[PDB]
Amino acid sequence: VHLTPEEKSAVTALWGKVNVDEVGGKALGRLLVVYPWTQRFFESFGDLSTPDAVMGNPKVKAHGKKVLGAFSDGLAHLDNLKGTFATLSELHCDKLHVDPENFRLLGNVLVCVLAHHFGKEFTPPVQAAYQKVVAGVANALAHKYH
Amino acid sequence: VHLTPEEKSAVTALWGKVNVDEVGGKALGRLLVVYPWTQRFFESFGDLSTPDAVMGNPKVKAHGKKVLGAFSDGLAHLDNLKGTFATLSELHCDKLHVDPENFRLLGNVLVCVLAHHFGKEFTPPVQAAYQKVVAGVANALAHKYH
Amino acid sequence: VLSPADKTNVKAAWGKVGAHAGEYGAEALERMFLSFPTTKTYFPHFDLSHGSAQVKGHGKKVADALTNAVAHVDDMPNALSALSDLHAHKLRVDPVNFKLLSHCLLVTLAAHLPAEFTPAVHASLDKFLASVSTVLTSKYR
Amino acid sequence: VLSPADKTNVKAAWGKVGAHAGEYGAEALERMFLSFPTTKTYFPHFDLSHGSAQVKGHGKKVADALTNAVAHVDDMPNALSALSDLHAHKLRVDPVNFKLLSHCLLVTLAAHLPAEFTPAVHASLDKFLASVSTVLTSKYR
Ligand code: HEM
Ligand code: HEM
Ligand code: HEM
Ligand code: HEM
């Protein structure tokens, strides 16, 4: 993915302010709440019956932390997401068989979380820069299907 | 895109039987008929008011011939569709701004045309091989968006 | 929306399918499993190899549901309500998967009904399957 | 489907938008044009730069249509029928584009309504926009 200097700046500055122990869980929990078919892949996580149970689920929060970790790594290798994501592409595509559209969905839910967390600071140009990043990460995670 | 020998065989053998002066126009015309928003990009083609006008439109038939030509070229370079398709990706993405989902749609409509034309010969395994090809062509045409 | 012409086209094409309904439902499922491998995970208790009695039996169920939708085309949400709850709530079928099966059903019909699969009828069938798919994913909205 | 809880959640959140309706409609459009450049081609007679009176005026129209849908949420197909014909027949708007604008509308609401944009309300709004989008693309099925 190619971000202009202007966009790299937008992305990096916002990211340095992200609570990395919390934001991932907020995005994963919202993905499970808003697009409930994704819960199919998380049966071992326990109670996902209501939004409160999902958001307060310890495993959702821990797993989200790993997901955010992967986005952080991608933000650091925007020029080789394919390589950065090979192992994870193999897991999500070859092993779990997650349809790649859900990669786009999780990226958009993360964008919604960032907007909710940063408010006015998440301006339209900053959002545009993040859309390029999440589309980049989604395409790399789907490499094993291409 | 990686096809097994078995699939390369399936694809190449069927393709050698395709009427290349006709099949492209049948796929493009059906794309315009079945998913009518695509007509937005073909205003200069004239009468597209009914299915008969679309299918019998000389320009639809001529344009489809070019589209089929591109698929033929791709079938010949399954190991560098990105390169084979660079110029066309630039046209469809940078110039016309066609949403890439329509690339997947045109590929699936071509698959429907092949099934209609070959009947029982277009077996489930042969179809699977062609789905890998059209997904490959669609991903390459969308490269300029990635 | 399904127009009067679309309803006529679908009833006509489905009419030609006849005793082959279940066989075509099974062929569509097989084409789906071979073409879009991700869909196979919904069927663990099924052997999906060619000639499988389970895929054959399930193809008959899919055909019967489509036939019910054709027969009550003006009341589709009600007719497929229980099926909608099953696929969305219990099975958690990804919405994208309905587009995949719909495509395989069109391919199967195109492969068996050369005279009937005209561009106009192809369009009506696509709209019919899109409508069925909308209903089946409605317990998500 | 939109459940009773979803209708309450949407009316509540939209209620907090208040006099800001049109401004948010315009911000959503701008976010859409910047984030998904392909959508700009539908607006040739519009200058889409920030502060554009046309995008501001058009944001008010989009908000008013959403407000009409909220107000007649149980009769959405009828309420948005003319808008449906316009976007599908005349404008030929690609169905994918509704998902894009819907996403930008959620982002805009999340950016302006911190207290209201809870996971439950986010889900209701997503379902509401999905329903609006289904209606707006229905003159395709
Ligand atoms: C861009 C989006 C995504 C990213 C960056 C991502 C990242 C990750 C990471 C880092 C792990 C842990 C890997 C490890 O244990 O070494 C993981 C696991 C997992 N992910 Fe994702 N993921 C994404 C989307 C999805 C989606 C959409 C689903 C399905 C709804 C999904 C389902 C799973 C499952 C089931 C596991 C557990 C694998 C196991 O431990 O056996 N992921 N993901
Ligand atoms: C995989 C799918 C597709 C392939 C292989 C393909 C291939 C081609 C080719 C070979 C040309 C002629 C290029 C030239 O004149 O040098 C062309 C032109 C064009 N295509 Fe496509 N195309 C695809 C999909 C689409 C879709 C989905 C749309 C939009 C609905 C579209 C719209 C156009 C337009 C408007 C032109 C005319 C460009 C001009 O002459 O100014 N194409 N395409
Ligand atoms: C045109 C669309 C579809 C129709 C008409 C349809 C119809 C049906 C019917 C009639 C049943 C049997 C219900 C019963 O026993 O009461 C069923 C079951 C099922 N369907 Fe579908 N279906 C469709 C699409 C899908 C898709 C796209 C998937 C997933 C890829 C799917 C996965 C399943 C599964 C997993 C079962 C349960 C099988 C079992 O455990 O016995 N369906 N469907
Ligand atoms: C939530 C979804 C949407 C709503 C509620 C909505 C609403 C509206 C309304 C109320 C109008 C004015 C109609 C009139 O003047 O009578 C309009 C016009 C228009 N819309 Fe949308 N719209 C939506 C999505 C879209 C999308 C996704 C696109 C394309 C990317 C689009 C493109 C247009 C265009 C090109 C016009 C005409 C502008 C002009 O020529 O003046 N709309 N829309």
Domain CATH code at residue D22? 1.10.490.10
Residue C75: which residues within 8 A CB-CB, separation 6 or more?
none
The size of chain A, in residues, is 146
DSSP letter at A118? H
Dihedral angle computed from the Cα positions of residues C101, C107, C112 and C114, in that order, rounded to the nearest 10 degrees: 140
Quote the distance between the C-alpha of residue D111 and its chain's center. 15
d(CA C91, CA C7): 29
Count the Cβ atoms, other than its own, within 10 Å of residue A95. Answer: 9
Distance CA D128, CA C141 (A): 7
Give the three-state DSSP class for B77: coil
Q: Determine the residue among C1, C3, C7, C140 to mutate to test chain D binding: the one whose Cβ has the most chain D Cβ atoms within 10 Å.
A: C1
Q: Which two tokens stand for residue B94?
A: 């940078």
List, in order, residues 6 or more apart from D68 with CB less than 8 Å away: D79, D80
- At B128, list the tokens: 């699977």
Nearest CA to ligand 1 atom 25: A103
**Which residue does chain A place closest to D105, by CA atoms?**
A112
In angstroms, the CA D54 to CA D60 distance is: 10
* DSSP line for C77-137: HHHTHHHHHIIIIIS---HHHHHHHHHHHHHHHHHH-TTT--HHHHHHHHHHHHHHHHHHT
Q: What is the span of the domain harbouring residue C14?
A: 1-141
The superfamily in CATH containing domain A1-146 is: Globins (1.10.490.10)
The answer to whether C131 and C76 are in contact (CB under 8 A) is yes
Residue among B29, B24, B38 nearest B101 (CA): B38
Residue B99 DSSP label: -
SS3 A35: coil
What residues of A are in contact with residue C96 (Cβ under 8 Å)? 99, 101
CB within 8 A of A59, min separation 6: which ones? A44, A45, A46
Measured in whole angstroms, the distance separating CA B81 from the mean position of its chain's CA atoms is: 14
Listed residue (C141, C12, C10) closest to C74, CA to CA: C10
| CA atoms in the 13 A half-sphere facing the CB of B73 | 17
E strand or H helix that includes residue D104? helix D95-112
Could you say which DSSP state residue D116 is in? T
- At A57, which amino acid appears? N
A70 lines ligand 1 (CB under 6 A): yes
Ligand 4 closest atom vs CA D80? 5
Q: What secondary structure does DSSP assign to C53-74, as a single string?
A: HHHHHHHHHHHHHHHHHHHTGG
Whole-number Å distance between alpha carbons of B48 and B52: 8
Please state how this structure was obtained.
X-ray
Contact C65 CB / ligand 3 (< 6 Å): yes
Contact C30, C50 (CB under 8 A): yes
What is the spatial distance between Cα D137 and Cα C137, in angstroms, rounded to a whole number? 15
CA distance D100 to D79: 22
In angstroms, the CA D138 to CA D140 distance is 5
Alpha-carbon distance of B107 to C35, in angstroms, equals 13
Count CA atoms within 13 Å of residue B127 on its CB side.
Answer: 37
Which residue intervals of chain B are DSSP H helices?
A: 5-15, 23-34, 51-55, 58-75, 81-89, 101-118, 124-141
Q: How many CB atoms are closer than 10 A to CB B134?
A: 22
Q: Judging by beta carbons within 10 Å of its beta carbon (0-12, 13-18, 19+), is residue D43 exposed, middle or buried? A: middle
Please tell me if residue A40 touches chain C, with a CB cutoff of 8 Å. yes
C61 in contact with ligand 3, CB cutoff 6 A: yes
Domain count, chain D: 1
- Structure tokens of D101? 């604008």
Q: How far apart are CA C27 and CA B126, in angstroms?
A: 13
Amino acid occupying residue B32: L
CA A9 to chain D, closest CA, distance in angstroms equals: 16
For chain A, the structural domain boundaries read: 1-146
**CA A107, A12, D35: angle at the middle one, nearest 5?**
45
B1 and B133 Cβ atoms separated by less than 8 Å: yes
The whole-angstrom distance between B44's CA and the closest CA on chain A is: 33
For residue C22, give the nearest of C132, C129, C108 by alpha carbon. C108
